[model samples]
Target: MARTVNSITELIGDTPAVKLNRIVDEDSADVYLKLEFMNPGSSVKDRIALAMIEAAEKAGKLKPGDTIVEPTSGNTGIGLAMVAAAKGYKAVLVMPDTMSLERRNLLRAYGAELVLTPGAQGMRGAIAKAEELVREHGYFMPTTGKEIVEQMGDQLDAFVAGVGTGGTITGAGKVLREAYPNIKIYAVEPADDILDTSIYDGVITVTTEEAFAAARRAAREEGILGGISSGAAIHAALKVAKELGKGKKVLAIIPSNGERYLSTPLYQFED
Candidate 1:
């Protein structure tokens, strides 16, 4: 029989990977980018959204016809919307107004409700709104880490990823640690010092400027168009890859697409 999934939720994980040529020198370790943007919802959060909903279904916390109220920076809402529609649940997402119009429209395209919080209020504002709406509703908040191991299915000397929910680093690092004890986990973010990231062997920090620069480089050289978060991961990974030298394999998670950031300064320049 031909292979076909009954629902889009089944399309959540198992994203594709690509190698970085221009970002790393020939003598340096190879960089493999786990393109989470390839997901049906266009982010790695799709994996976690399906996981969370199915888990809720199993535990009786969520049932068909129930609604899912979630707060997201952008991608999680898209993931939640995708899974909620497939799994027969309504999704109401609280997101910051700062997010791109592309994100807002994509969620709406999937039939999710949108409550926009002030951009200055940020994700915290969205979370507060979600909590307020979820009162007594008992709606499930859906949320991944480890498919990077299976996605690579091979040797990984270093796994570099930026912290968002801190879920990707904590959850996947724990799994990868047990499987490859010698593997190095680099928790990357927009800063180098005074970091609060978790479950990492080391920290590789980059400035927002560096991240955008890296994003531009990846788009220009590798044809990989990732968001700012992914740029930070790529920046840090390249930094480590340079130091690690030959005989190392570094895997980085390109969390989402640059299409959402096209309107922002992330891609703006004097032409």
Candidate 2:
């Protein structure tokens, strides 16, 4: 039997959920990593890119040959670029200059134009630029949280993910909460980043060094090459899992692949 699909967009969701082995202690709750980097664009943002475009088209907000423009740290831009290329639309991505070079190259590989803003200005500057472009050129700004149940089932005791756009945790949290009212949801962030504590049951902060070290451990111990944010999420997930102890289930979302960070120090070994 042969499986054929018209577009790569069909390969967005249904990522694998793999349980951790050596990285987590046997005394702790079983930790599972949702490998979202398996998506077509190699990141979880692929789901949102396709959904946003399709929704806009259904509402008549987007049409044939329309240009899509948005500000992204990296993964979202790559997702949008991949989607736009497949759908026959032009994609112009605005990103901070501080982002990895591999990200910029990947966007160009997808034939999407790139606009790099000053790194000092950060994401806010990139967003302002995208907004300016949208007003001037009439581009569409494209913006899934519910696949966890299908991948991990209702037995999940906790859901953990890094807070980037907050789409992953917020969307999946809602579905997981409805299915299991007692389920705990935890949001992970850099030690310097803060979010409204009301959204999740708890917050766990990981430093950059901690995140990178955790990511390295996942690669060496579990053969999972996750990005920095994924490392942060996993670090937080481990903390929660340890507290829950044995007989509990904890799942964390690995948002993007580590290959995307090769240009940075994420995968680099320091002597």
Candidate 3:
């Protein structure tokens, strides 16, 4: 169904939930996936964007004159910008210079002002710059804002999203934990090449030999397009679903769409 909205700003929340029927080995448990990428901005950042900015306004930290600023490569910035734009709040995004042009263009499409940081330094540099802006300039970190804190309280277990802002996973997870102490949050990582991203950092992308070899084999046999990171998340979610002792309602986020990794090894890019 096509949702008609007066503005992209109108397309913030209400993502549909999907159940994964093809994968998974056990009939005792089922895997449900929420398609957050369908958000108007084409990613899961919408939730964070709304949660972060609205919280600021309620806390009196963001008034008519203040701006929302953060270090981001994509989702977080778009989410924050979409929310701030609706309220006439200034939104500033500090992003990686090396990020593909596609991401920068997406931010512009949302009316967010973008500042490029060194891509070579990754999120480490982005974090430092964001902190500097927050400490010295009093830029608001929407993830920690009170309004978001409250909404997060209500839908904590709705779905699992590891956005790296620490807000989505940490803050949102807090809500779920309160209701279900045994709740487990899963983080997506590269298949085999793993890197240490501090508690707040994220594994934006990863590759898995096990996933590709196993699922790809089946996908090739059945004409399905099972890719790596998603397979990795699926594998991890199943484990969590099991530890919860099965027969429990659990949700996971398919962080990226199949189209994003369509080409993969077959899809070539110039390095």
Candidate 4:
């Protein structure tokens, strides 16, 4: 088969899935990780980014010379930057200064303007900055889950993902729920964080230390270069797989790649 595409946006979806062999115990259920880092922007958010831009274009809200502004940690911003670059729109992404330098650099590489907010204020500060800029400069604020069922079918017994904006779990969980009525959906989050309980069957909390450790193990043992959130998702998936034991199946979404976190402590190991 031969494939060619006019733009990189055409490479956004249909990411491959790989099974975890050494990471999961042999007695536990099989665990599969969806490699979303394969997307053009190196994260699952690429789908949403393109969809939002195209939707705005169809609605006549965005025309030539319109600027797209958004508040993101890293992944979403990178996605938006990539889309804006391909579509010939100006992109201004606001993110917290606490984010890795790699992320800021990646966004700039796409020719996007980077706005950095105080790290202490977190995403809220970055979002407020984006809103303020939007009001002043009149930028376009651009604001998916069913594909997993199509990718893995009804063979999955449980689904797991790290809770950031709740877009991934809620969207994919709903479709998986309808397709496999008894499927369990687990939302992974930082310890002391929570999300809408109704959408997921349970919550798995992983400490920052645990997440980094898991991510490192994923790189070393499974050869999967996923981010901290991906580590959290896989850690939760392993928990679900252990509970389900043999004959069941667990699937996790690896949201982004480790390359984006190279400048951060995500890859720094002391063992």
Q: Model 4 over residues 1-271: C-alpha lDDT tens digits?
A: 5679999998888888898899888889999899999988888889888888999899898988788888876677778989999998988889899756665677889899988999999999999999999899888887145667776776889888888736766677667877888888887999757755658887799988888878889899989998888878878888889999999988888999998777668987576
State the RMSD for candidate 4.
Answer: 3.2
**Model 3 Cα shift for residue 232 (angstroms):** 2.3
Which 10 consecutive residues of model 2 have the lowest summed lDDT?
Answer: 143-152
Task: List where candidate 2 sits over 4 angstroms from the true fold.
Answer: 99-102, 142-145, 193-198
Poorest 10 consecutive residues of model 4 by lDDT?
142-151
- Could you tell me every candidate's TM-score relative to the true structure? 0.87, 0.90, 0.65, 0.89
Model 2: clashing residue pairs?
145-172
Per-residue lDDT tens digits for candidate 1, residues 1-271, read 4549887777777777798888788888989898888888888888777877888888888866988788876677778888888888888888898766666777888788888988899989988888887776766675134576776666778988887736767888778877677888887877747874448888777998899899999999989999999899888888888888898888888889998678778888889
Distance from true position, residue 93, model 2, in Å?
A: 2.0
Best by TM-score: 2
What is the Cα-based TM-score of model 1?
0.87
Q: lDDT (CA) for every model shown?
A: 0.81, 0.84, 0.57, 0.83
Model 3 clashing residue pairs (backbone): 49-79, 49-80, 190-206, 190-207, 191-207, 191-208, 263-267
Clashes per prediction?
1, 1, 7, 1
Q: lDDT, candidate 2, residue 26? A: 81
Candidate 1 pairs with clashing backbones: 48-143
What TM-score would candidate 3 get against the native?
Answer: 0.65
C-alpha lDDT (0 to 100) for residue 191 of candidate 3: 43
